[PDB]
Structures are given as C-alpha cells and as structure tokens.
Design a protein around this ligand. Structure first.
Ligand code: TRP
Ligand code: TRP
Ligand code: TRP
Lengths: 252, 252, 253
C-alpha cells in the first residue's frame, strides 16, 4: 500500500548525494559566472551558489568542469548530480532535464569593434548580410544572434576568450553575450571596443538542471533558493560578481 | 535499482505528447479567451498560449472544444492532454486535477440592464431577493454570484451568448462574468446596458490543468510559463486580447 | 495498464489518505499568536485559521495534534498527523527529511531585553559579547539566529518558554531571541522590567507547510491553495490581524 511511493523517495538523486557525502556539480567557464583564478581554484557567482548549497546540505562539493555544448549529455549519463552553470531555463532543454525555480536572471548584450562597426548605434545595424557576429557555442547567446540578427554571418566558438580575441583583432563586428560581459569588455579595451547600446535585449531566468522523475530533489532545491533569496544573499552575490570588478585581481 | 523512477518518467503525459507528435488541448468558448473566427477557426488569448506552447515543445497542436461543465471529466478520461481554457485554479477542482503556476490573472465584474437595475449604483444593490443574476454554468462567475449576492436569484446558462441575451432582453438585472466581458458588452450595447462599478471584485490565478502523478509535465509547464513571462510575451498577449478590440475584425 | 506505477503514486498520496479519512490531521505547537488555547478552551491564532480554511476548502473536518516543538518533525515522519501547519520556517536541514510548500507567511527574528542588565543597549553588536546571556527556544530558528548574530555571547537554549521569561524578568538572562512580534508583545506587556532595544527584524524567513516526501500531488494541492488565498488577500489580512493588532487579546485573558 506504500511501496511505489517509498521507492521513489529512495531513488531520488538527493539520496544519492547524501549517501556519497559529496555534491557533484557540472559547470563551464564563463567570466564571472565560473572561472579558474591565479591560485588554480574555481571562483565565480555559480561557484559561490554551489558551495553554499553543498554546505547547507551538509556535504562536500566536487566540481566537474565540462564542455558547455556537452553539459546536458554529461548530466544525463551521470557525470555529476546537478548543473549549476548559469543555465537559462529553456523549453528545448526541458525536454531532457528538469529545472529549478530561478535563482538568477540575465539578459543579452552586444559589444562591437570600433573600426568595423563605426557608426553602428542600433540593434538593426548589425542585422545585415555583411556583418560578422561571434557568440559562444551552444548558448542562448547563439540563439539570440540567430533571432535578432538573422541576416548576419554567425561564427561560433567553444571558448569565451577566443571569441573576444576575434573581436579585439578586428575579425568580427560584434560579440553577442550575456551582460555584464559586453559592458565589462568595452570598459577593459576602449582602444578597440565600444558598447553600441546600454541595457539588455533578452530577459532569461536561470535555474539548476537535474535529471527527471525527482520531485524530492526539486523540492529541496526550490526551498533552498527561496530561503537564500529572502536572506538577501543571492542579491549580494549577484551585485558582487556582476555589478563590481572587486574580484578582478584574483584572475591571471 | 531505479525502475520506479524510470517508469514514472516514461509514464509522464509529456512523453505521451512527444511520441504522438501532437499536443491535444481542451478548451471552451469565452470571448476573447477562445472563440471561432469568421473562417470557423479558433482564435483568442488561450489559443495563442496553446499554439506557442506546442510550437516550443516541437509538436503540432490539436484543439478539442468541450462543454465547460464536462471539461474536467474529459481531461480525466483522456480526451486531451491539458486544459488551456482560462481555468481558475481552485481547491475543489484540485481534488481531481493538478494545476500549473499562474500564466494569467482575472477578476469578476458585473454588467447590468439599465431598465431593471435603474439606480443600482453599488454591488450591494444587487444582493436582494427580487434581483435576478445570470452567469455561466460551472464557472467561478456562478460561485462569485453565490458568494457576493447570496440573496439574489441565480440563472445559469451553458452558453455565453444566451446569458448576455437575457440581459439585453431585460429578463435579468445583471450578468456576472470575468473582466473584460462586462465592460466590453456595456460599451457594445449602451442602449440597454451599463457598468455600475469599474474594476473587479475577485482576483483569480489562471493555470493549466493536467492529470495527477506527473511531476515532470508540471515542471515543463511551469518552466515554460516563467520563460514567456520574463520575455514579456504573456503581457503583450494579455494586452492585445483583453485591453483592446483590435481583434474584432477577425470575427462576425 | 502501462500507467501502473504512476497510478499507484497517485493513490499513495497523503492527499488521498486525508480525503478517505474525512479529516485533516494537523501538527502544531503553542506560540502566541501563531497558535494558542483561548479561555473557551479552543485553539485560535494565525496557524489555526490557515489550517481551518485549508480543511474547509478541501471538504474535510480538521483535527489538531498539539506536539512538543522539538519533536514535531519526528511526529510527522511517524504518521502522527498529515501536515505541519505550525509557523515552521523552511530550512535546508529540515528539508533533508521533509518537503516544504511554497511560503504562506514570512517572519523575522526579534529580541526582548531586560532593562537593568541591558540598559543602554541599542544595536545587535551590543549583545554580541562574552558577558551577555541570551536565551532562545530549542529547535527553532531563534536558536540558529542567536548562534549566528551573537556568537560571542553565552547561549542558554530552553524548551519551557514561561520559565525562560521568568529568568529574563529576574535578570538571570540578558535577552530572549524570538520571532516577531513575540518579543515586542512581552515588552509591551511588562514595561517596567523589559524593553525592545532594536526596531524591526534581523532575519527574513519564509514559512511553509511540511509534509512527507514522495508526494508531488499533495504539494501541488497545497501550493495551488496558497496561490488562491494569497491572490484573494486573505493571508495578508490574517497576517495583519494576528501579528500587527491585538484585536484578539480579550479572547485570551
Ligand atoms: N545563460 C547561457 C549561458 C551563459 C552564461 N553566461 C554567459 C555569458 C556569455 C554567453 C553565454 C553565457 C545559456 O544558458 O546558454
Ligand atoms: N476562469 C473561469 C472561466 C472563465 C474565463 N472567462 C470567463 C468569462 C465569463 C465567465 C467565466 C469565464 C473559471 O475557471 O470558471
Ligand atoms: N519559525 C520558527 C517557529 C516559530 C514560530 N513562532 C515562534 C515564536 C517563537 C519562537 C519560535 C517560533 C521555526 O521554524 O523554528
């Protein structure tokens, strides 16, 4: 009279984590979401979120850096328990994984090369056949480039630094990427780069991704988000990482 | 040692939809939530919601128009996968079906007959035993009439146009219905009708209804709502259908 | 057939257990004005009102199972009742064993101090000192808060609230830490001995129902119910009545 329900509880990935004593977290490099610093340790907003979640669960944390384009297959094949990697909740991804409630929000922005894109002042100036746009492979930045600049030539990169180097070198007109990356890079490299428009042109809820059939793990993650949101801690961390450069000299 | 969990995933109605290639949606006629255009094809706020959801799942959409009084039994016996019908989340209904998070909010309003309700300037003027009120059978409008005008005689109709026609004919004092229907009809027929009070006297979250034991389908629907809400799409659609009459030329 | 596991999960929900019994069994503990016995001998308060409307909207009777707070989660786990509706803060350590609804209320921590021992105190830091003795209820988030915000002070955990106040009045502790509005009530009650050194609250804690795990249908029902009564304004009206007025005072005496 209770077997099915008890078996569902036992098979939760939350129970797998508790038995192992370690939360295994899949993520990828996006500055300042997650990145290796000069001491060789991972830091960033997503790292702070994952480290606190592990601590509040009473377990150790282990990070499993993964190629972003293969991060969902890695979750599905059990390379880790959870994606904490600044993943936008999306209905195509949700076919394969389940999402928590949002713990952050992001929006898409654009940074441009001063010589190639001189005089460009509007989104539509980049939606032309002769314009080359760079974005990160497998991300919502690529999807936004296709949606808002469909006539542009889109060039995808599996590495964030390789994409910005193309822009610095004058090989593409713009990089499309989540704020605050475009604004930060325009301020970092004013000799080569500029920010044509302030603000953002998408609004994207960010959630944890976990494997399906696990309502108990979802309950735990959503309850955890609600508590640290009400505490003001997510706002504090969002401001530190995305609205200051106080962490800048931790990096190589 | 994970059969129960793997079987729950396989038995989700989300997987049933994906393998069929078609989302089957139950709904009923309420202008402008869902109604036939002059070609005989369905249009409205709820139709647009269902069409986007199906498209974002990668499937076709098939509408199953249903008598509202039997729409939950139809869901339970498998006539369709989901109710996208402007349904208020309610605890009695929740005994039989599960509800998504809200994708819309509505509120109750009243439109009155000028001759029978001459002088009725307040809501309490309609809470009298000599007053007759019409409402749609099986809706929260019928419940609202029972709660806020318990002394009045309630006349129920399974057809929206039949109810407003009784009001137009001077056979009832008022129709209780979700905004914007009362305001729209008072502006459409000022010779017969008037709106004694602006604004609404209920506030009702609107949710999808699906069959129980399906946490995976619930996760998908709620994550979808969060994405299209943040995009501003639900707001745009709510404004077009419920705050303008720009769609009237599609009807007749 | 082909839906066996799913149909069994539906049938094994505690929601169905409640509907078949015809009665909702609610675990709670006595905290004024969350839940308390009035002078007619009946339970009243914010949590009682929430539980009574939930039961009525479910179509069942309600039965309250008063339980000692430190043992309330073990009592839920062993089936002494169906649900905790007892002002319980959603917390990650508790969530290891039970599941939580979305929030139906929020609380924040406060503090009530002895006038003689804590004369001149006016900030949180004044109480964070080795000589300061602080009391908090065992097993509550007041104990966690005292540990976090007053780590240097000597912490006296208790489970007899009346005895803790007796010690605060005779000056055997400097302050009592507890969820607002209770410290303010104790201060506004005994203005000669006690006072309220800090205005407002220094935590923000979402409050949720707690239920046994593996029950996504019961969670859906509880969360949908909260959404409806929150939209109606009813929860905020009940929060105001119990926690921001004393209109209920003379039901007690
Ligand atoms: N949210 C993006 C990933 C992302 C995070 N930070 C970024 C910065 C730039 C480009 C992409 C990103 C996605 O889900 O696909
Ligand atoms: N929300 C109502 C249905 C509804 C939508 N639009 C309406 C207009 C008039 C009356 C009822 C309705 C319900 O759940 O019952
Ligand atoms: N929210 C507290 C319980 C509580 C409610 N009201 C209180 C008043 C005093 C002390 C504790 C409480 C907890 O979960 O631990």
């Amino acid at each position: 009279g209770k077997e099915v329900r008890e078996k569902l509880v036992e098979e939760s990935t939350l129970e797998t984590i508790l038995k192992r004593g370690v939360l295994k977290v899949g993520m990828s490099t996006f500055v300042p979401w997650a990145m290796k610093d000069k001491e060789g340790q991972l830091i960033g907003f997503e790292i702070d979120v994952a480290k606190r979640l592990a601590r509040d669960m009473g377990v150790k944390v282990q990070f499993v850096p993964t190629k972003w384009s293969g991060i969902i297959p890695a979750l599905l094949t059990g390379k880790f328990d959870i994606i904490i990697g600044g993943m936008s909740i999306r209905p195509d991804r949700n076919l394969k994984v389940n999402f928590s409630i949002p713990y952050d929000y992001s929006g898409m922005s654009l940074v441009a090369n001063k010589k190639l894109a001189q005089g460009f002042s509007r989104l539509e100036d980049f939606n032309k056949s002769e314009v080359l746009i760079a974005a990160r492979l497998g991300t919502t930045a690529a999807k936004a480039a296709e949606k808002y600049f469909p006539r542009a030539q889109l060039k995808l990169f599996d590495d964030e630094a390789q994409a910005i180097q193309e822009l610095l070198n004058g090989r593409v007109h713009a990089v499309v990427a989540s704020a605050p990356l475009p604004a930060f890079k325009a301020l970092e490299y004013p000799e080569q780069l500029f920010l044509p428009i302030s603000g953002t042109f998408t609004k994207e809820p960010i959630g944890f991704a976990i494997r399906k059939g696990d309502p108990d793990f979802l309950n735990y993650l959503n309850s955890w988000i609600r508590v640290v949101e009400a505490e003001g801690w997510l706002r504090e961390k969002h401001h530190y990482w995305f609205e200051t450069k106080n962490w800048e000299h931790l990096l190589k």
